[PDB]
Amino acid sequence: PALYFCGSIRGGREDRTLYERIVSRLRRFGTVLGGDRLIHEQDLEWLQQADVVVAEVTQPSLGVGYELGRAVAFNKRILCLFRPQSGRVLSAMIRGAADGSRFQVWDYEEGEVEALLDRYFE
Amino acid sequence: RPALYFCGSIRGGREDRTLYERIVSRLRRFGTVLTGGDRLIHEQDLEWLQQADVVVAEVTQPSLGVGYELGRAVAFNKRILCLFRPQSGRVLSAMIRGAADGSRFQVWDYEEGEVEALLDRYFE
Ligand SMILES: O=c1[nH]c(=O)n([C@@H]2O[C@H](COP(=O)(O)O)[C@@H](O)[C@@H]2F)cc1CO
Ligand SMILES: O=c1[nH]c(=O)n([C@@H]2O[C@H](COP(=O)(O)O)[C@@H](O)[C@@H]2F)cc1CO
């Protein structure tokens, strides 16, 4: 099962350590998948090849949002992870895109991310 | 007269709110700016996005919602104009910079004082 992970880079790398923890756990469950144009084209190729798109959506990021919008239109299963401890109110576009099944948005505490992913990936 | 959809950060931060108001004021000279909790916001916005002739986004302040709108817009094959200010000190997302094809999806770097003139040139 092919997995695509999204998290902020140019939006800010505040959560980089957490992203590595998520990716580490995702590798147990499946394959974790020129300038900026080449980045965009390669990422779109991988998004089209994914079975599940997982996004850590706590740090606001244009690229993460864009990946999620393309993923929806590519008919992908999506899991978004948001930390209320950030003090932020998550974007209405992401919270409102969720349907609770093929697009899920979960609030979580950092210490529990491994258990949440274990649950989601059954 | 085109139907227009404007994107700019809200929950990402409202740092550029006055500039967004200037952009919308100018867009209104050219066409109609189309503009249940978060679900209703998403659904109504997606209806307007499909109706829009041009999607205009100010992409300087990072925002999940603006990025999402742009991703959905690309998949709807909308004409898209993104406006970015390098004097902000930020580096624009590769996903937005790299999505540009120079015609249907354009990214223009600009200085804040010039936004009305730039919009004039695009909608001329
Ligand atoms: O070099 C890159 N290589 C790349 O794959 N991305 C993709 O876009 C999102 C970050 O978007 P952002 O925060 O940078 O806007 C990530 O989930 C994913 F990493 C972005 C950049 C730089 O933009
Ligand atoms: O109330 C809202 N009403 C709404 O239309 N949006 C749409 O999403 C983008 C901002 O995304 P964000 O920065 O908030 O993530 C805007 O271009 C556009 F405004 C967002 C929210 C709150 O999220």
In angstroms, this model's resolution equals: 1.1
Q: Which domains does chain B have, with CATH numbers?
A: 3-123 (3.40.50.450)
The dihedral built from the CA positions of residue B2, B8, B14 and B18, taken in this order, carries a sign that is negative
A82 CB neighbour count, 10 Å cutoff? 21
Q: How far, in Å, CA of B4 to CA of A112, rounded? A: 43
Q: What is the DSSP string of chain B?
A: --EEEEE--STT--TTHHHHHHHHHHHHTTSEE---HHHHHHHHHHHHHHH-SEEEEE-SS--HHHHHHHHHHHHTT-EEEEEE-GGGS----HHHHTT--SSSEEEEE--GGGHHHHHHHHH-
Tell which residue, A116, A24, A25, A97, has the closest CA to residue B65: A97
Burial of A91 (0-12, 13-18, 19+ CB in 10 A): buried
- Indicate yes or no: CB of A66 within 8 angstroms of CB of B95: yes
CA distance B116 to A85: 39
CA of A93 from ligand 2 middle (Å) equals: 6
C-alpha distance from residue A99 to each of A79, A102, B15, B18 (Å): 11, 7, 31, 34
Ligand 1 close to Cβ of residue A110 (< 6 A): no
Q: Identify the experimental approach.
A: X-ray
Touching check for A66 and chain B: CB below 8 Å? yes
Atom of ligand 1 nearest to the CA of A6: 17
As a whole number of angstroms, the distance between CA A19 and CA A112 comes to: 14
Q: How far is CA A18 from CA A26, A50, A95, in A?
A: 12, 21, 21
Tell me if residue A4 falls in helix, strand or coil. Answer: strand
d(CA A60, CA B66): 10
Tell me the C-alpha distance between A64 and A4, whole Å: 11
